[PDB]
Symmetry: C3
Subunit: 113 residues, 3 copies
């Protein structure tokens, strides 16, 4: 049950959020080896941000997965998510961060896994 929070400084519309959600569903299944229905995704658009001396279009994506990551998984996720944010949002790769964490515990449907 991974969580992916997407912060961007630009506006997101239906089209971009759907396209990103489908990207994240694909990487959850294909790279993370997990069911795509179980990735919970939040979108935080028009976030005031500052990076490398400016407020120009920038993104920070956070990935949370219980049990951490396989050895080649984060590099793949970073590659795919970056290109997708550049595609959909027009944000340049050198203004995109992707951070990886793993929680200690995760509850879903009232119970912990």
């Amino acid at each position: 049950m991974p969580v992916i929070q997407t912060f961007v400084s630009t506006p997101l519309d239906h089209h971009k959020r759907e396209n990103l959600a489908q990207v994240y569903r694909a990487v959850t299944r294909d790279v993370l080896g997990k069911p795509e229905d179980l990735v919970m995704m939040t979108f935080h658009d028009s976030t005031p941000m500052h990076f490398f001396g400016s407020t120009d279009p920038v993104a920070c994506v956070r990935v949370e997965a219980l049990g951490g990551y396989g050895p080649s998984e984060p590099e793949k996720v970073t590659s795919i998510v970056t290109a997708a944010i550049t595609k959909e949002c027009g944000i340049v790769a050198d203004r995109i961060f992707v951070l990886y964490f793993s929680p200690l515990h995760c509850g879903w449907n009232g119970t912990n896994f």
Copy 2:
């Protein structure tokens, strides 16, 4: 000094935020064994989200506590928070995540604990 961030895809009004804050104050004291005045709670309503193939009402609650959790605490917290979000927001349990982390350090009142 725990932190609880509540993201929901639905609107929260005064009534729901107060009711949730009182739920979180109670679980901090009764389950976490900590002073209820020291839980900091943030509310992020009307968050665009995607989960299990849809944007239907969904919640993600994050819990951060320095020093981690007792062996039965996360299951209790998850049970209480889930029911409370279902009660106040009408969000179904199988569309509610609760993630648990613990920071390395925490500052309050200008000093670290």
Copy 3:
């Protein structure tokens, strides 16, 4: 490549966000010993919050740094960030939290570090 997310319950304007960004750039370089251009900062103002029995002006700052922190760094960061939030926002020190985490992995410019 640290990340600093600033949540406050009060409104932030251009002036406050610029002033805080410059504070965070300075502490990244001077305390964290890292390039100030590489701190990514997000600002989340007018966040509905609850703490110590009220919704009065309150702040939660999250700091994420790959590889963790030197022994005296978090205390310094907490001291500087707290005073700066009190200065710019008028939020009292005993209503300011600063949490420190470190991600497992970080991507920037399509690649992981």
